[PDB]
Amino acid sequence: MMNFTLLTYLADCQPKVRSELSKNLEEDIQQLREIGLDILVDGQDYRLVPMLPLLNPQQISTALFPYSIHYQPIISSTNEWILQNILSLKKGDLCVAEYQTAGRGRRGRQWLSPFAGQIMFSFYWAFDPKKSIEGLSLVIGLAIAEVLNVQVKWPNDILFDERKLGGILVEIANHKNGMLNLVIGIGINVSLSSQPYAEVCEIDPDVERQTLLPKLIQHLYTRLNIFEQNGIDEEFQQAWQSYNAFSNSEINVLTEQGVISGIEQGIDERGYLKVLCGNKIQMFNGGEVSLRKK
Numbered sequence: 001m002m003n004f005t006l007l008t009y010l011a012d013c014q015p016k017v018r019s020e021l022s023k024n025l026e027e028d029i030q031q032l033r034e035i036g037l038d039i040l041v042d043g044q045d046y047r048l049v050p051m052l053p054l055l056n057p058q059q060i061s062t063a064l065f066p067y068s069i070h071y072q073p074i075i076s077s078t079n080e081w082i083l084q085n086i087l088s089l090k091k092g093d094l095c096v097a098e099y100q101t102a103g104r105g106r107r108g109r110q111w112l113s114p115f116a117g118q119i120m121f122s123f124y125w126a127f128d129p130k131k132s133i134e135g136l137s138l139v140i141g142l143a144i145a146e147v148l149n150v151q152v153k154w155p156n157d158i159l160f161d162e163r164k165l166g167g168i169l170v171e172i173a174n175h176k177n178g179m180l181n182l183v184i185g186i187g188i189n190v191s192l193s194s195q196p197y198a199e200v201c202e203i204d205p206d207v208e209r210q211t212l213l214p215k216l217i218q219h220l221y222t223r224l225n226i227f228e229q230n231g232i233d234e235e236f237q238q239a240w241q242s243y244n245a246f247s248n249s250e251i252n253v254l255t256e257q258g259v260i261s262g263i264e265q266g267i268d269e270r271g272y273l274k275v276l277c278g279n280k281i282q283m284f285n286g287g288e289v290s291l292r293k294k
């Protein structure tokens, strides 16, 4: 299916004149095209087509000092890199990529991205193991919607035009620190190409991944620090409400045991969804449970 060494030699998106990095050049290139990577040829020069201008690692570093950045055009998953490199990291160090050969959703699912058309990054984070991470996904989602001026959806979705603008994937590292060690994965659609999807280019055609990435991370980190102090406090619930695309709406709540319906009533102190069902407020925990507008 894929010659990883090719692509990797091609990942600089630069005009290479037919050096061999293989056994079936036309085959693997068409196989790379079948995966979906775009490879244009002009006579004898081959070139991998970034959907957007490649990022510049040195600029991210200086823009995000003292946090350390690992940049890598092609990767399996920026989450995997944080996991495999956890010992060398401090709170807030990041991995950034252009394309993921195995981008992870929740629960075995996949994350799709064309080459260089997303903001894809993961980072290490850590809490006191006594402190609860109830609501963490809400904090991440809100921080991004505050930067991009878009809307959130419980528990972790980023929304423009009621369309999926990106994904958030919090994973727990089995690392022995005396701390709770997270890797936090974020994908934000910028310029793409199942369900309809949103991309930042719709809203601001002059978006630049190079300066939006540090803007996202600076606010994300800030929102997180506020969360270590205040949790899902009443300021948060108000900030949430203002960005909540489903505030006080008639919704369907999809759990493993079926559908329950009602009117959304925001969130409680643990980040649980609050829903007026019949005559009581019922609460739900974000794992797997999904939300839909009636």
Ligand SMILES: Nc1ncnc2c1ncn2[C@@H]1O[C@H](COP(=O)(O)OC(=O)CCCC[C@@H]2SC[C@@H]3NC(=O)N[C@@H]32)[C@@H](O)[C@@H]1O
Pocket (backbone or CB within 6 Å): 077, 078, 079, 100, 102, 103, 104, 105, 106, 107, 109, 110, 111, 112, 113, 120, 121, 122, 164, 165, 166, 167, 168, 169, 184, 185, 186, 187, 189, 194, 197
């Ligand atoms: N680019 C996209 N935009 C919107 N929806 C997508 C999409 N690609 C796939 N989907 C659909 O979104 C579903 C998964 O939604 P979930 O809530 O289960 O899973 C997520 O939404 C979290 C995925 C987060 C991606 C970033 S990318 C870098 C860090 N490194 C990783 O590997 N992941 C994080 C997929 O099964 C659907 O096909």
